[PDB]
Amino acid sequence: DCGPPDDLPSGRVEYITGPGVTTYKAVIQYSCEETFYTMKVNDGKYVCEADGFWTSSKGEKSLPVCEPVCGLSARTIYGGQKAKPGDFPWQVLILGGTTAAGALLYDNWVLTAAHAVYEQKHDASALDIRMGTLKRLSPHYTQAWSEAVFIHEGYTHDAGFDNDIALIKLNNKVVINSNITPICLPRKEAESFMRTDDIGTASGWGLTQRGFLARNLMYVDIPIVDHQKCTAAYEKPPYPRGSVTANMLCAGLESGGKDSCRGDSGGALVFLDSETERWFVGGIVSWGSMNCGEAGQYGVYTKVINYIPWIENIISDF
Numbered sequence: 164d165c166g167p168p169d170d171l172p173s174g175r176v177e178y179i180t181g182p183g184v185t186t187y188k189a190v191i192q193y194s195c196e197e198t199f200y201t202m203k204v205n206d207g208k209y210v211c212e213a214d215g216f217w218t219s220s221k222g223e224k225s226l227p228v229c230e231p232v233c234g235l236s237a238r239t240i241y242g243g244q245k246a247k248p249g250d251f252p253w254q255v256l257i258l259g260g261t262t263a264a265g266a267l268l269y270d271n272w273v274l275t276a277a278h279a280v281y282e283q284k285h286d287a288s289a290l291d292i293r294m295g296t297l298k299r300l301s302p303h304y305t306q307a308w309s310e311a312v313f314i315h316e317g318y319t320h321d322a323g324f325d326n327d328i329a330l331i332k333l334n335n336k337v338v339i340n341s342n343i344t345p346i347c348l349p350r351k352e353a354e355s356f357m358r359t360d361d362i363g364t365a366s367g368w369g370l371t372q373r374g375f376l377a378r379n380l381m382y383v384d385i386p387i388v389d390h391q392k393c394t395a396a397y398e399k400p401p402y403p404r405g406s407v408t409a410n411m412l413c414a415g416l417e418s419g420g421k422d423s424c425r426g427d428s429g430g431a432l433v434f435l436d437s438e439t440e441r442w443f444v445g446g447i448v449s450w451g452s453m454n455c456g457e458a459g460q461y462g463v464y465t466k467v468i469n470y471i472p473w474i475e476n477i478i479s480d481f
């Protein structure tokens with residue numbers, strides 16, 4: 164009467180009343196892989212209704228959603244040290260024009276910087292996306308490819324870095340495990356963890372103090388800089404006036420020695436929601452001075468909390 168149910172992505176169907184019964188008042192049950200995924204919308208119990216279509220205990224006749232767990236880390240680039248497996252399970256390597264990075268969202272999206280993927284999007288060439296690996300050049304990695312690249316509509320390439328943000332839709336769902344896990348998006352009160360002098364963490368394979376790209380994933384803990392000091396650090400030649408906007412945050416040391424650098428573009432500056440005990444993305448590696456690690460020449464990051472409406476619009480509509 165209602166027919167075979169639809170399959171649940173990252174979940175499955177199980178007939179409760181009997182194997183194959185699909186008639187009126189027949190009961191089925193949905194479920195996710197609860198260890199690394201969590202069911203949303205409803206509790207998964209659906210009863211065939213007189214309308215002739217499966218209906219949940221809340222009246223919905225659409226599937227539920229198996230959302231990946233996010234923000235998990237085995238913890239709990241200039242002047243950093245080597246990450247261990249599972250410290251940054253969201254870290255993504257993006258290979259195209261040059262080496263860049265991103266962060267896994269859900270199991271089929273990658274958050275990165277617009278400047279890192281702009282030339283390859285408009286050249287209509289797919290991005291080579293790798294993850295589940297600490298070594299930049301290892302042959303053993305989880306492979307994915309870009310199905311679509313969305314660059315923020317206010318971004319103007321080669322004309323500053325306001326709105327330096329982009330989303331990549333992966334053509335396949337990646338398997339979620341302790342090795343590969345997305346980063347959480349910040350909640351509306353997440354700014355309480357991103358005040359001045361609050362500590363975030365940048366990770367990447369970019370240039371180190373040696374002046375070469377790192378073979379292994381690195382990371383640094385660095386504090387948020389007062390926005391006046393951020394504006395003042397880059398309000399001078401050769402930078403255009405207004406290079407630092409309200410859509411940006413600075414991070415680093417007035418004495419120097421800890422920074423992001425070239426090759427870290429698109430990586431997530433993450434912060435710990437100490438109450439949920441989950442890591443979330445507060446920044447995206449965007450730009451900064453030529454001399455990474457130099458005193459008062461802070462790294463500049465795109466402010467992700469400003470772009471939650473844009474991210475949710477794109478992920479929900481595509």
Ligand SMILES: Nc1nc2cc(CCNC(=O)[C@@H]3CCN3C(=O)[C@H]3C[C@@H](c4ccccc4)CCN3)ccc2[nH]1
Pocket residue numbers: 278322323324402403406422423424425426427428448449450451452453454455456457460461462463
């Ligand atoms: N202290 C620190 N320096 C950093 C560098 C990076 C490089 C990753 N981003 C890039 O490579 C992008 C694409 C071109 N870029 C620059 O940054 C140049 C361009 C120019 C400018 C014009 C207009 C407004 C502002 C700047 C002048 C010098 N910065 C990452 C983190 C870092 N932390």
